[PDB]
Coordinates of N, CA and C in Angstrom, one line a residue:
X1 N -20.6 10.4 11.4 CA -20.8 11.3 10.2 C -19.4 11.5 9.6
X2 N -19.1 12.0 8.6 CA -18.2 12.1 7.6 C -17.1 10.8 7.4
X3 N -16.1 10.5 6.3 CA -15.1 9.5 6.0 C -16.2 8.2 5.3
X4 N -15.2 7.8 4.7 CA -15.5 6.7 3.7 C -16.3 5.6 4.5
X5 N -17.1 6.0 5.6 CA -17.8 4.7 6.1 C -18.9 5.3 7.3
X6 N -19.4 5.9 6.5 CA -20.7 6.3 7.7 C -21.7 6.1 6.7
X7 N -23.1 6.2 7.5 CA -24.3 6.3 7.0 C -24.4 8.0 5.9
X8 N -24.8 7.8 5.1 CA -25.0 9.0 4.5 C -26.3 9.4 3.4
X9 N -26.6 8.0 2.8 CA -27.6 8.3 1.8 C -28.4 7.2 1.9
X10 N -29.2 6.3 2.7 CA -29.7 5.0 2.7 C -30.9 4.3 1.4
X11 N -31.3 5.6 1.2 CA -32.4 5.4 0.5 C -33.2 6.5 -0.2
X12 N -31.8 7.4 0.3 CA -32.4 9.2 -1.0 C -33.0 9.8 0.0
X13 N -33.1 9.8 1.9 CA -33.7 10.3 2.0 C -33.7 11.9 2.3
X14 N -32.9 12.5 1.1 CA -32.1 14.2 1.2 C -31.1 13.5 2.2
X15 N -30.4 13.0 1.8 CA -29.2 12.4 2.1 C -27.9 13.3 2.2
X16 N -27.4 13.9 3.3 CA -26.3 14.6 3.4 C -25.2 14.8 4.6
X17 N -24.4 14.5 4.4 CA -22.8 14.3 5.5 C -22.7 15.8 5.6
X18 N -22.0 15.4 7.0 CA -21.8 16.8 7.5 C -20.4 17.6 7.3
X19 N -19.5 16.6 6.1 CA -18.5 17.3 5.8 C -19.0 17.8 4.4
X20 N -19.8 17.5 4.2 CA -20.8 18.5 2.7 C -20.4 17.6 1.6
X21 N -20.3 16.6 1.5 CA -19.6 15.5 0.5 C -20.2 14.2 0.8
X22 N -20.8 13.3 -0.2 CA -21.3 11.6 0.2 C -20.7 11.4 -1.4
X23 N -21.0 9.9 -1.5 CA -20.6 9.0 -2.3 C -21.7 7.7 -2.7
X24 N -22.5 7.5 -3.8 CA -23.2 6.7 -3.6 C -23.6 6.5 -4.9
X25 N -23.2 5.2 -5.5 CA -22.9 4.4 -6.7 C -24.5 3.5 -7.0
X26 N -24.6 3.3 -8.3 CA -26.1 2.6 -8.7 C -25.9 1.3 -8.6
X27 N -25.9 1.1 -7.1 CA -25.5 -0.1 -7.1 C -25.8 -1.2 -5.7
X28 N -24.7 -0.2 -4.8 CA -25.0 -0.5 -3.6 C -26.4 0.1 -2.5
X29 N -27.1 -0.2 -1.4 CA -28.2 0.5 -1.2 C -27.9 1.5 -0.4
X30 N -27.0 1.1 0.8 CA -26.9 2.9 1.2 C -25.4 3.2 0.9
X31 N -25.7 4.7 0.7 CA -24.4 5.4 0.6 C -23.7 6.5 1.5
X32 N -22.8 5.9 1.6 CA -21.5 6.3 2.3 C -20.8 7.5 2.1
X33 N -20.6 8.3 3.4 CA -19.9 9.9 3.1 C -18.5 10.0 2.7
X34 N -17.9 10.9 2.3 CA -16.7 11.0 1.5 C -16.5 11.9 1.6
X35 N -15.2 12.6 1.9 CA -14.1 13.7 2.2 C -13.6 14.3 1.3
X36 N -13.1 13.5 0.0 CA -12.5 14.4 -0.9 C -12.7 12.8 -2.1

């Protein structure tokens, strides 16, 4: 969990990192947690 390379949002499903921050672009399919 948390940093620019974990599982975080794969497919919307209430998708949420446990540093309280993800990152997830209309583009790629899952999205990835983020720190700042």
């Amino acid at each position: 969990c948390i940093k620019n390379g974990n599982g975080c949002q794969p497919n919307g499903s209430q998708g949420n990192c446990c540093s309280g921050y993800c990152h997830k672009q209309p583009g790629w399919v899952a999205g990835y947690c983020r720190r700042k």
